[PDB]
Amino acid sequence: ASATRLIQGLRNWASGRDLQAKLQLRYQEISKRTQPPPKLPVGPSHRLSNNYYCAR
């Protein structure tokens, strides 16, 4: 949170323990944006020699 003295004591004294993840969600943990570019898998089929469309 922002610098808080004696008011954060008020809040610690009213509603109990707090300060883990201030309700406002504003502190880091934003993941940056896509450090790697995404690359996706491809599931079953998408393979020659295994399959004919009739079976699957």
Partner: protein, 230 residues
């Protein structure tokens, strides 16, 4: 008396001695997927999509030209058949351009229809894809021959019905061009009808051009004028 019992999926049907396989399956409601065969045009073995398995018989027979002896049992959905259809569709789609956005028949062309409702769902074969020099013919018929599947329909029609005899094939293997060798204009009465017979977007209507698209248009029965044939 000049009738023959031949099973279809175990369902007997009485047909004439010498009606084709494809007709015999038409009678009970099977429509075997096809290209080069056409109701008004003589038979040819070109498309190969008509393949169908007959039980007890090792090889698959082409349903277009195969006459029906007594007691053939025609299995349409037998695994061997479906594998054959997937194969043929694959080899056709091997060399074809991707024109479906630009191509005029996109809402119609039977490669898309039969492609979904029969052939396999994923292609193969990366390095490939031959191309063909396109050939201007008439003012009526716009011509992109890259899309040609070389199914011989246009030939057989021009020959037999139109009677002009000016269309043919020149080449072998991958390279066979279907059309006039000398780059002559082909124009006749009934000639325009060829744009209906070409199953793919190879031939199309020049004036109708790009304006419309099949699913968007509302068909309406009508009659004709300008000719007393009604």
């Amino acid at each position: 008396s000049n009738l023959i019992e031949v099973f279809v999926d175990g369902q007997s049907v009485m047909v004439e001695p010498g009606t084709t396989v494809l007709q015999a399956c038409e009678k009970v409601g099977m429509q075997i997927p096809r290209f080069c065969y056409h109701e008004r045009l003589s038979v040819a073995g070109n498309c190969r999509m008509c393949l169908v398995e007959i039980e007890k018989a090792p090889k698959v027979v082409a349903a277009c030209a195969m006459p029906v002896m007594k007691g053939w049992n025609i299995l349409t959905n037998s695994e061997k058949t479906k594998k054959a259809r997937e194969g043929v569709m694959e080899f056709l789609l091997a060399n074809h351009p991707l024109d479906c956005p630009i191509c005029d028949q996109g809402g119609e062309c039977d490669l898309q229809d039969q492609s979904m409702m029969f052939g396999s769902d994923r292609s193969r074969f990366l390095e490939g894809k031959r191309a063909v020099e396109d050939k201007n013919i008439g003012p009526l018929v716009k011509t992109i021959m890259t899309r040609c599947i070389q199914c011989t329909r246009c030939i057989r029609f021009a020959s037999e019905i139109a009677g002009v005899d000016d269309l043919g094939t020149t080449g072998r293997g991958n390279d066979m061009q279907v059309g006039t060798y000398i780059e002559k204009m082909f124009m006749s009465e009934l000639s325009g009808n060829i744009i209906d017979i070409c199953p793919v977007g190879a031939l199309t209507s020049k004036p109708y051009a790009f304006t419309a698209r099949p699913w968007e248009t509302r068909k309406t029965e009508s009659i004709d004028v300008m000719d007393a044939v009604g």
